[PDB]
């Protein structure tokens, strides 16, 4: 059965994400509402539904932390200078991120974000980062709970898309790599568990107008790991 | 038939020491950080950060 058949959408469905554990599907579009559906085979019903006024949404993501796997945030954002974060509690407590901590000129719209995990690498403490794709070549990485700007990674060209790769190192330590593509086809990989420094820079063979990069086969941002040893 | 009582609280009363800069805030968060334990000069207030009410 069509998942949003129970409660129709009033716009084109711009983003779509499953929950990492629960049977929930979050849809959202330019009608500035976001809907969660308990999906099954027969009767995909609507769990809850939140209409953010004056804020059409373009990307919406279930985030679930690695430490306790008990937060269940929803980060959502559109063509705005803010990004909402709903804390799932089954009223609804949402917060708004609207401060680039000195970096507002290079981030004029919170549309293209991605959420990922990051490790402190002196403690074994992970925390979520949101990653915002900005104007020049910039990716502004900031904390997913405090909203503090952690670091920024600039590629040379027109930034078009990016993805997050993880690689394990030892027992309980992994490393986060940001993979960002020019429009022209040249790809930067930034190690960002340290300071956001480039470790590899390669070039796509062929390809001249590049719109979308993705990784897969392990833990992406859309197949997320529930436990840190499962990365 | 008249009786005196003290019924309502007072000042929060942090560390009133000299020679301690920084940590003079003796209020604590819980470990399951849902309620905030502040002393007063008359009592220990325990507020709750979710509902902003005093719960104990």
């Amino acid at each position: 059965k069509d998942a949003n058949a129970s409660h129709p959408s009033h716009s084109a469905i711009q983003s779509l994400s499953f929950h990492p554990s629960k049977p929930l599907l979050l849809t959202g579009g330019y009608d500035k509402t976001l809907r969660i559906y308990h999906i099954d085979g027969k009767t995909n019903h609507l769990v809850t539904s939140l209409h953010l006024v004056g804020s059409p949404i373009q990307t919406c993501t279930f985030y679930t932390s690695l430490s306790n796997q008990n937060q269940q945030n929803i980060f959502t954002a559109g063509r705005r200078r803010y990004m909402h974060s709903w804390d799932l509690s089954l009223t609804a407590k949402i917060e708004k991120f609207s401060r680039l901590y000195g970096h507002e000129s290079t981030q004029r719209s919170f549309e293209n974000f991605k959420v990922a995990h990051l490790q402190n690498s002196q403690t074994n403490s992970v925390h979520g980062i949101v990653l915002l794709q900005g104007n020049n070549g910039w990716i502004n990485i900031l904390h997913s709970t405090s909203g503090l700007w952690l670091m920024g990674c600039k590629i040379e060209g027109v930034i078009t898309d990016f993805c997050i790769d993880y690689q394990p190192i030892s027992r309980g330590k992994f490393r986060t790599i940001l993979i960002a593509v020019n429009a022209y086809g040249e790809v930067w990989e930034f190690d960002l568990n340290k300071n956001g420094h480039v470790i590899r820079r390669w070039k796509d063979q062929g390809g001249v107008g590049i719109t979308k990069i993705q990784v897969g086969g392990g833990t992406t941002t859309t197949c997320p790991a529930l436990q840190i040893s499962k990365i | 038939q008249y009786k005196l009582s003290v019924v309502s609280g007072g000042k929060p009363a942090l560390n009133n020491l000299s020679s301690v800069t920084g940590n003079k805030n003796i209020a604590r968060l819980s470990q399951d950080q849902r309620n905030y334990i502040i002393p007063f000069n008359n009592q220990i207030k325990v507020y709750s950060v979710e509902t902003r009410q005093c719960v104990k």
Binding site: P23, H38, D40, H45, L90, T91, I94 | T51, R52
Partner: protein
């Protein structure tokens, strides 16, 4: 249609066990019917096509027996979260109904076979099958103490069965469709109700004669009877509840419902009741508030009016009033 595939109360109506699908796999959860005395952990069926066909509360480590569709009765403790023991027949046939009396579990098969298991010994005691009963989908033990004689088996047509002779001793005219509820009321009566009809009939288990017919005003999903036959509450297809008060007295051959309860929200949206529970003066109704999470309500059903409309508070357009901010933002 309802996401809750199977659901049943414990005796005394204190907990509700319910099987719902969760993104192509069945999951079995238990909720307390009153919090004043969430439970966020489920039993997960790990196969995409293994599913629960029936479930029964045992009575004292508390457990559920879940009759699956691969010839197995799983026995699952609820305080822990594992199937403690896996009864199996020799076959792969789905099992249509189970029951137990004391420690003696009985079950029916899709090949119309009867199996008997012992919960104290974890063993298949008996396996048999009887003639002219060929589409069985309900059994009910007629209670006679620790003796577990006289099963009562339905196939659209109820048949009383002596197990020492493995033979049929009475034959009741059932329905025109498969029987969906078949429950013993007193030591001389049993109620039965079929799939897709709104007529229960109470039969006399000693003669075969139908005492009375009970008429819901919508197709009956589940029923509960209070433990002393004085009240029967059925829940129907349109999400309503109908209480027949004292149905076993002299509205002479067929009786209508005495009380009818439905739930609406503050809006006008009618939520459906599934699977209520009744006892002496106390009635506990269940619905789903969000998509699959059950909410309950206790009611003194003897002092409510006849046409009762429970009102629940449910989010429809409410402005998200944050506790850390006044109304002016």
């Amino acid at each position: 249609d309802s996401p809750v595939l199977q659901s049943a109360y414990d005796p005394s109506g204190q907990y509700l066990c319910y099987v719902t699908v969760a993104l192509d796999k069945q999951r079995v959860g238990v909720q307390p019917t009153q919090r004043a005395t969430w439970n966020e952990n489920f039993l997960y069926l790990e196969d995409s096509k293994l599913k629960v066909t029936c479930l029964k509360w045992v009575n004292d480590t508390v457990a559920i027996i879940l009759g699956m569709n691969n010839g197995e009765i799983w026995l699952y403790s609820v305080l822990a979260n594992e199937v403690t023991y896996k009864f199996t027949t020799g076959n792969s046939y789905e099992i249509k109904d189970i029951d137990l009396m004391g420690n003696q579990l009985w079950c029916i098969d899709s090949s119309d076979a009867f199996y008997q298991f012992d919960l104290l010994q974890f063993k298949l005691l008996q396996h048999f099958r009887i003639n002219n009963c060929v589409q069985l989908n309900k059994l009910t033990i007629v209670p006679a103490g620790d003796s577990v004689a006289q099963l009562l088996v339905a196939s659209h047509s109820i048949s009383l069965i002596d197990i020492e002779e493995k033979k049929v001793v009475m034959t009741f005219p059932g329905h025109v469709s498969p029987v969906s509820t078949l429950q013993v009321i007193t030591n001389e009566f049993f109620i039965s109700g079929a799939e897709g009809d709104r007529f229960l009939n109470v039969y006399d288990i000693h003669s075969g004669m139908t005492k009375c017919v009970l008429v819901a005003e919508s197709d009956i999903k589940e029923l509960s009877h209070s433990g002393q036959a004085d009240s029967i509450a059925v829940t129907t297809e349109d999400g309503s509840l109908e209480i027949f008060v004292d149905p076993l007295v002299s509205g002479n051959k067929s009786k209508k419902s005495s009380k009818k309860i439905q739930i609406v929200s503050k809006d006008g949206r009618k939520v459906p009741i599934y699977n209520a529970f009744i006892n002496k003066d106390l009635l506990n109704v269940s619905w789903l508030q969000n998509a699959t999470m059950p909410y309950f309500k206790n009611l003194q059903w003897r002092e409510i009016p006849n046409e009762y409309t429970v009102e629940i508070s449910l989010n429809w357009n409410n402005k998200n009033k944050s506790a850390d901010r006044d109304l002016h933002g």
